[PDB]
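Final report, section 2: Outcomes. Of the targets proposed, SAKe6BE-3HH is the one most frequently requested by collaborating groups, and we therefore present its record in full.
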Amino acid sequence: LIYAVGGYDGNTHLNSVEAYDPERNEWSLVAPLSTRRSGVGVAVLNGLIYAVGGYDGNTHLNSVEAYDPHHNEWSLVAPLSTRRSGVGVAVLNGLIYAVGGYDGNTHLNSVEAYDPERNEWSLVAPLSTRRSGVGVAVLNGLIYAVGGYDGNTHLNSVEAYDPHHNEWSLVAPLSTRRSGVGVAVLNGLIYAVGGYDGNTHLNSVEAYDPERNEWSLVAPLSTRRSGVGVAVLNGLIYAVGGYDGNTHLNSVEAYDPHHNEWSLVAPLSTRRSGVGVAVL
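The predicted structure is given below as tokens.
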């Protein structure tokens, strides 16, 4: 299932959570979060969905909660060291990494890692650049931080974290500055989906080949989408919700890399931008 967690429907921040079953092309609502959360990072570890940070409408959040699908329950665990909305979240070597974000009064280059065995976050090497609205994914044992916003420019830059040496290094930038970008890994490529370049919301999509350190543009989305959640299921990339510039979206579309095409599927129950999306 694809879980869509939190977000913003235009006129309220959401604690609701819904799950997509591709076999029936249906979304259904499950247990909500303890707290409304938009700009939330969402990752899967040891059979739980972790919802990390976010914005509840009136404060940026350091709290973290984990969803157990066997009991349809969220439970709060150890909070981040820093409030983080617009945070990117990925799983590597059994840790959850929280990458960048916005604490309310500064955009963050800091990065911290959660160990579920000890219920603790610890700070590791920071990014080269402050990044909120950053997309994060894991490929070949590295964490890639893709685009974002440093406070005073939207970013096309991309950097990769090597946990063996606790270091980030900059690689090839995107073709287009992208904040609020969704990122996922499929067939050994990183896809950067939509986002916002500073002066337009984007429908474009580009794929990174680490063997050649190159991004290349592929088929665009049907709709411009920033603040979009992206996940991979059954060999398709799903782009979930987002914001097209002039409406928040409930629509969902799926990318087939074999035919280089997106197609619209069942929409969410509610419009959701800044939504976190994970597969469990």
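The chain is about 0% helix and 50% strand.
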